[PDB]
Amino acid sequence: ANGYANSVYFTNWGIYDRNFQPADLVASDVTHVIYSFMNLQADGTVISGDTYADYEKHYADDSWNDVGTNAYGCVKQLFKVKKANRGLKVLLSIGGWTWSTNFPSAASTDANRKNFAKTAITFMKDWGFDGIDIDWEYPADATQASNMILLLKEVRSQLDAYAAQYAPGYHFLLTIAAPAGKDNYSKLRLADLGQVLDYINLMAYDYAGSFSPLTGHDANLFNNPSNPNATPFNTDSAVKDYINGGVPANKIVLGMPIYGRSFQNTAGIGQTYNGVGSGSWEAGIWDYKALPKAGATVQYDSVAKGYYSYNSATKELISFDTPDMINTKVAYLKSLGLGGSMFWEASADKKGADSLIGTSHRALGGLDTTQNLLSYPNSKYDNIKNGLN
Ligand SMILES: [Zn+2]
Ligand SMILES: [Zn+2]
Ligand SMILES: [Zn+2]
Ligand SMILES: [Zn+2]
Ligand SMILES: [Zn+2]
Ligand SMILES: [Zn+2]
Ligand SMILES: [Zn+2]
């Protein structure tokens, strides 16, 4: 709004094995935290996928003897973050890869869309959040694409009505996560999305993995015509298609991965491979903070603009973003007038100089300082209603 976005996904399941709590966020680097994910029913009902993580878990200073009805979990922890970081906005994210199967039904009728908006906004206002992010992966045809716009317009309308009563003058944010593959984005109502939304977070990653016939760059900027098997996708073609399709450049936030995708038993990038192997927490996927691994050296495809660790002894290649990659992507996004950087996801980042999110903050320079909201007079949680005072 008044500067670049530097946003990050915070997953509610990251509080378990990953042990990444909201207090662990380096909040000074972040303009938006995208709190992920709420689930969705076929009738449009938005629901918590984890009530413990969301609002029940007691942290060390969460009393067992508070009066009233009170929110704990990540909700209270994030409200603390918001108080201490007035330029940091928290968005309620709905859907994702696993929980998008009910979006078509949820967007399909006026009643369902109204129920979606009301239930989503109820969580947002109860939890003390600044907006809503919709991650429908992915609208499959024209009917769904049109219905997505109808859904977003309903949420925008209801947000504005909510603010007029309970946060006058505050602009609640409405965003999406958006596909970088043309097979998906060619179905979207791009011009409508450009008009109705505050931000489009481009998922400029997951270009290559276990689903690909050869090793590929996961999040490269450009095609490599001298080694095109290494670049099954590229970000630049997607960015230009979004802008030319009617999404204003300043609303596009360039997603970047804080993880690598591994390829086993291979000679290099663009080449044959056997499996993806193990991961940090799930097969084929490695936290950036574990990379590069011991005995691996980072190489760079300067045409594609993509790095990868290589270990000459084990034949493991891992495609991942480095601090230098982030500097290059920030130079790129600034050159096209984009709105900033987005990251999936917070728990996997390094701390200090090698933080991808911190690298992005420094390369962007002037971050969005638009003030968050701390007034929730209609929250059902007394502690949120009282601003934790
Ligand atoms: Zn476990
Ligand atoms: Zn309790
Ligand atoms: Zn996703
Ligand atoms: Zn507004
Ligand atoms: Zn707006
Ligand atoms: Zn995951
Ligand atoms: Zn700064």
Number of helices (H), then strands (E), in the chain = 11, 14
Q: Is 145 annotated to bind ligand? A: no
Closest ligand, as measured to the CA of 281: 6
Q: What is the resolution of this structure in A?
A: 1.8
| Cβ count within 10 A of residue 69 | 12
Residue 52 is given by DSSP the state: I
Give CA 71 to chain center in angstroms. Answer: 24
Residues 6+ apart with CB under 8 A from 93: 9, 34, 35, 36, 37, 38, 132, 133, 134, 135, 177
| Cβ count within 10 A of residue 305 | 21
Closest ligand, as measured to the CA of 18: 1
Residue 151 is given by DSSP the state: H
- CA 57 to centroid of ligand 1, rounded, Å: 16
Q: Is 29 annotated to bind ligand? A: no
**Closest of 226, 222, 241 to residue 325, by C-alpha:** 222
**Closest of 332, 167, 176 to residue 251, by C-alpha:** 176
Distance CA 134, CA 198 (A): 12
Q: Is 95 annotated to bind ligand? A: yes
Distance CA 89, CA 79 (A): 10
Distance CA 10, CA 22 (A): 8
Two tokens, residue 182: 């043309």
Q: Report the residue count for the chain.
A: 389
For the chain, the straight-line distance linking the first and the last C-alpha, in angstroms and rounded, comes to 29
Pairing of strands 285-287, 259-263: antiparallel
Q: Report the DSSP beta bridge partners of residue 94.
A: 38, 134
Residue 293 is given by DSSP the state: P
| Cβ count within 10 A of residue 59 | 14
Distance CA 69, CA 28 (A): 30
- CA 96 to centroid of ligand 6, rounded, Å: 11
- CA 137 to centroid of ligand 7, rounded, Å: 32
Closest ligand, as measured to the CA of 52: 2
Q: Is 98 annotated to bind ligand? A: yes
- CA 90 to centroid of ligand 5, rounded, Å: 15
Closest ligand, as measured to the CA of 13: 6
Report CA dihedral (92, 118, 378, 84) to the nearest 10 degrees. 10
Experimental method: X-ray
Q: Is 205 annotated to bind ligand? A: yes
Give CA 203 to chain center in angstroms. Answer: 8
- CA 100 to centroid of ligand 5, rounded, Å: 24
Two tokens, residue 317: 């290649």
Distance CA 128, CA 388 (A): 11
List active site positions: 137
Alpha helices by DSSP H, the chain: 51, 73-84, 103-106, 110-127, 142-166, 182-185, 190-196, 235-244, 323-335, 356-364, 382-385
Q: Which structural domains are found in the chain, ordered by start? A: 1-257+321-389 (3.20.20.80), 258-320 (3.10.50.10)
**Closest of 188, 164, 158 to residue 176, by C-alpha:** 188
Q: Is 130 annotated to bind ligand? A: no
- CA 362 to centroid of ligand 7, rounded, Å: 7
| Cβ count within 10 A of residue 249 | 15
The full DSSP string for 130-143 is SEEEEE-S---SHH
Are the C-beta atoms of residues 145 and 107 closer than 8 Å to each other?
no
Burial tier of 79 (Cβ tally within 10 Å: 0-12, 13-18, 19+): buried
Q: Is 218 annotated to bind ligand? A: no
- CA 137 to centroid of ligand 3, rounded, Å: 7
Q: Report the DSSP beta bridge partners of residue 89.
A: 32
Are the C-beta atoms of residues 88 and 15 closer than 8 Å to each other?
no
Two tokens, residue 267: 């000679």
Amino acid letter for position 313: A
SS3 97: coil
Q: Is 96 annotated to bind ligand? A: yes
- CA 352 to centroid of ligand 7, rounded, Å: 15
Distance CA 178, CA 242 (A): 10
- CA 95 to centroid of ligand 2, rounded, Å: 27
Q: Is 136 annotated to bind ligand? A: no
